[PDB]
Structure 1
Amino acid sequence: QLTEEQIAEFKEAFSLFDKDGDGTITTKELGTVMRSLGQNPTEAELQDMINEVDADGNGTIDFPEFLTMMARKMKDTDSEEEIREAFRVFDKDGNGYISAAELRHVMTNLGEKEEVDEMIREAGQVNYEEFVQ
């Protein structure tokens, strides 16, 4: 299944990109939703997605169908390299060094917000490949 936060984000994006509020979005704006959720598709793949599902003639996608399409697209799209992209975003220096206090501060204030005191324990140098294990 998908995570609760993921489902909430997908629902909010679907609602935001449903212009007339009928419960469905068209093919034109599906690529914009994909890009908005981070899964920017290629021209060929985007055209494939447009054609395959919407060959029904209606040309609209309801939310359960969108959830299915994104679950498929997320089945194999985020390997370890994309996962460590976010870790490298913090890489001020190329040595793989990140103060654990910096991680606590960023994870609390700048993100989803007590969990950090337990996250750090399992985690002054924090080598990135060390934690992704």
Structure 2
Amino acid sequence: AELQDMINEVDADGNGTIDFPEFLTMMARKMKDTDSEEEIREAFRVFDKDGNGYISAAELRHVMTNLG
């Protein structure tokens, strides 16, 4: 399945990837956990496949449940 549709549902502003503000906002959207930019930034490099400082849908699967 193309995770592109998930990319489109996670995309808030149209950069096609989650940014620090977006990740935090989509997170806190209903569930609010940790908000320390260090930890959140650590997540960005962990979640992403390329660790390019952003969390995309495909990247989500890499880190989350699937192989990326």
What TM-score do you get using the length of structure 1 for normalisation? 0.17
Q: Are residues 1:52 and 2:9 paired?
A: yes
> Which of the two has higher C-alpha Rg?
1
The answer for unaligned runs of 5 or more in structure 1 is 1-43, 111-133
Work out the number of aligned pairs and report it. 67
Say if 2:47 and 2:55, in contact at 8 Å, map to a contact too: yes
Residue identity (%): 100
1:45-76 deviations in Å (ceiling 9; x for gaps): 98875322427553122111111111124169
Higher strand share: 1
Report the CA distance shift for 1:73/1:89 in structure 2 as closer, same or farther (over 3 A): same
Which is further off, 52-61 or 98-107? 98-107
Instruction: Name structure 2 gaps, 5 residues minimum.
Output: none
- Inter-CA distance 79–49: structure 2 relative to 1 (3 Å threshold): farther
Give a deviation string over 1:18-65, Cα, whole Å, max 9, x none.
Answer: xxxxxxxxxxxxxxxxxxxxxxxxxx9988753224275531221111
Q: Which has the higher contact order (CA 8 A, sep 6+)?
A: 2
